[PDB]
Amino acid sequence: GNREDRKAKVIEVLNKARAMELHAIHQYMNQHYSLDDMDYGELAANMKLIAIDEMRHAENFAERIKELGGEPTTQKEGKVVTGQAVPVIYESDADQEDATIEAYSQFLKVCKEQGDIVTARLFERIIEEEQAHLTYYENIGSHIKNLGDTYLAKIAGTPSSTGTASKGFV
Amino acid sequence: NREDRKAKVIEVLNKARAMELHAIHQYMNQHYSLDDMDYGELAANMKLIAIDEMRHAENFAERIKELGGEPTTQKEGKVVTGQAVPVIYESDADQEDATIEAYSQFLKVCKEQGDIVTARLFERIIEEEQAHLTYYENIGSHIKNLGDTYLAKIAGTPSSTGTASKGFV
Amino acid sequence: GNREDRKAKVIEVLNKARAMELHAIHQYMNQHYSLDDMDYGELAANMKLIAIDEMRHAENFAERIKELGGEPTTQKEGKVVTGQAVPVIYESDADQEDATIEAYSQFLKVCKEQGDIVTARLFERIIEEEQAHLTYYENIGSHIKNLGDTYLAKIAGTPSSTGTASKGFV
Amino acid sequence: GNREDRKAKVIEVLNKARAMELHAIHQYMNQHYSLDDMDYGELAANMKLIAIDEMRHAENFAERIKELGGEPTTQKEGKVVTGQAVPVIYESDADQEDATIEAYSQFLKVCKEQGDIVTARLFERIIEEEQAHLTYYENIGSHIKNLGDTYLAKIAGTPSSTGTASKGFV
Amino acid sequence: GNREDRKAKVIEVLNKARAMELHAIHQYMNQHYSLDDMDYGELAANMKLIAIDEMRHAENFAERIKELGGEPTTQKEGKVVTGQAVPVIYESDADQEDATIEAYSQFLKVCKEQGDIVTARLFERIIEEEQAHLTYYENIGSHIKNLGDTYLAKIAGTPSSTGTASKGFV
Amino acid sequence: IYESDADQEDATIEAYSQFLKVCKEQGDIVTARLFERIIEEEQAHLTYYENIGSHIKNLGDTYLAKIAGTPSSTGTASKGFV
Ligand code: FEC
Ligand code: FEC
Ligand SMILES: [Fe+3]
Ligand SMILES: [Fe+3]
Ligand SMILES: [Fe+3]
Ligand SMILES: [Fe+3]
Ligand SMILES: [Fe+3]
Ligand SMILES: [Fe+3]
């Protein structure tokens, strides 16, 4: 395609990815709110830290969309599922991460076909992070299935802190 | 009637929370524009205010959970994009004023429902919303009275909001 | 081809890239001398710092050329334009960086086609640095376009320091 | 026997021991990859730490063989068993350690018979370390046997770190 | 092909790579024992440090295989040549590293064809380390060729230490 | 549920053994035989609760999936007045 054609094709997959991150942020934070309510500290903390990774993916996608002359979407891709039980959280989060990695690896092929090396590299780095998320969700899911409440009894009452309060305006 | 009272508070908490989710997306959309323009200082403060709204959304969600509700995931109203710089501050100033009005109403319900803990949460957040309002009012005024003279001062300034966000990876 | 052919094809695009770097070094330093003479310190400093990134690029390209048995070129690609006014400096530097990314992306392709993974990673790294340079030049060109002498008035008489004198022999 | 007769008999028990070490390295690292995959951090870490002792043993046997003028073998003794369940891992590793102590004690007797005091002291030191491995594996197999999933729930999700990465070349 | 098919084809080239690392570890350590015996310390030190790099590669390949649900091989590919003279050591090691880089670049392509970005990145990073190994071996070969016993006289009696002993279990 | 009930039955058998002893000291053979009979039934409860508790602790979800949706009938309705 011409210069504009290529930019538009990449801005499209970037916005698709961004909508996926916007979904994960609301989905993972919903789950964090449940986990925190159950007082499963370590689990709630790590869920919020992964959601913050997704916020940063969302931001990186938007920044690159701006670099290419586009407008960052404000809509999340899909619907947020609430009230999930603990076994369901980790099962569905692992599935979701695996799907994202499949999706982003195709998005990557698009960028390479449209000759956009900078965007392809963004996708490669974020796919490596999604892999870290997948592995985490799978490990929790497997202990829960194999060890049940014995494992959860260990997590009950642990600290849920994610560190010092974040940089804000006030 | 404990359950009527929890239900009516949870309803305004979810209302305020959806106003926070909209604000987060609205202010970050403007942040990306300001950053693209290379008006660093303005871009940095717009993201810092977005992060304040994230913290409001979270506090509202946690209280909703304490009251046995489900925190909403949907934002109230539409995000406006491609806003020009004068419109960003004018519209952010208007939305912050509308939020203080809305939350003072929500505060009222909390007090009527005998929910002191939630009333205090709204009072605290309202005073932060006033800090944001004042900020947006001041920037809008400078832009209106000094125009490009004020912007040349913002051009090229750093946009960093601090050290990278705590994460999982 | 055999090993020699594939190496020779990569040496050819590395030396074309290197020739483009040698050009950018002389073109950006020429502009640096003007910016400095005009006493727009921050602009002059950053133009020289970008010039030094290009020096490092030229060096990295020649090191890879050496690894593959080739000889690093000493000729620059193209003519250095002198006497440019400030708006023209940033307009043409952004065009030149954009063109470089275009070119290096093709070169990247050659590397992949010849099975040279180490050389492909070098171009990938360097293209991301060029993207940073592109953004900088676009950003300046936009302030000059939108704010003109009101913006340059803020830059007038700023420090032009790029730091302590670079390591030398004497 | 004669001087070279004596060296050769020692070199032979040394090469038998070294082949047992090469096997141990691959057998315990295999178990480590499984324990790690299962996310039993503390079990995975100590398993890798023991394999690294076996690496040191292999190396010390090889340095002594060179001293005696022999050639250190490069072939492991026996087959590596894969897919073992957790109890079989600790059951089989303890038997392997007990067997190694037995063989090594016989190798030690050969060194004394061949009047090789330095090599015998090498065996003495290593048998003491193998005794430390044996006790370890017997202890874990005993907890798994007595406490089962309750013990494993405790290890689930523990850190698997064995320290800072290897000294290496790059 | 299907998801399971795609994992199977990547697991196969990962086990091919790992078997090559297992060979390199035994090959390089074998040469390390000769150089140490010869009291060429700097050479013995670096050869062992490169062998530790290959250990880390084998480990990284094993971990990815596990992530993909495969079983890490325990067998090395090819025969370890022993009794090499010093010049033969560096010629063959250089030749061995270039061949590794050729093979790994092929394995990389399979990863890409199977849509496995995380595994392609793993190979990309290890190919860069192998290139550092290749340059090293080529440089020592050049010095032995160009300077002979003069260069060896320099290395004679040098420290052979690779630092502090590796944390282990005992 | 099963952890606590096992402990409860174990406590009951210990207490009733002590009560049985008081009956023997008061020369009340009929009452002691009553405790004897009921202690043997408490032992069957204890054994029941300990076995379930073990399966839950050790086998988790596969065990409960077997119990999910099974019949909960305890037989024909109790004799009553109506
Ligand atoms: C809470 C909460 C919400 C609401 C979730 C919900 O559904 O309730 C929540 C929602 C969002 C949403 C959307 C976005 C995406 C904005 C967009 O791209 O349109 C979104 C975007 C960002 N968040 Fe966010 N948030 N958020 C935190 C809390 C919450 N956040 C905390 C805490 C930190 C702390 C970071 C730190 O300390 O390093 C934090 C950081 C960021 C960064 C900072 C990136 C960086 O500089 O590295 C970006 C961008
Ligand atoms: C000696 C010796 C042998 C025997 C070879 C022979 O043929 O004699 C030897 C053999 C092996 C073999 C196989 C493997 C591959 C195992 C497998 O994946 O099946 C194998 C695997 C590893 N070794 Fe190994 N060794 N080895 C050292 C010495 C020796 N090593 C020293 C020293 C360190 C010190 C590490 C450090 O402090 O960084 C060290 C560390 C490692 C690590 C950990 C690296 C890391 O975490 O970064 C892994 C994995
Ligand atoms: Fe993400
Ligand atoms: Fe993710
Ligand atoms: Fe707010
Ligand atoms: Fe606000
Ligand atoms: Fe360059
Ligand atoms: Fe450049």
Ligand SMILES: [Fe+3]
């Ligand atoms: Fe040993």
Ligand SMILES: [Fe+3]
């Ligand atoms: Fe041992």
Ligand SMILES: [Fe+3]
């Ligand atoms: Fe390697």
Ligand SMILES: [Fe+3]
């Ligand atoms: Fe290598």
Ligand SMILES: [Fe+3]
């Ligand atoms: Fe009972």
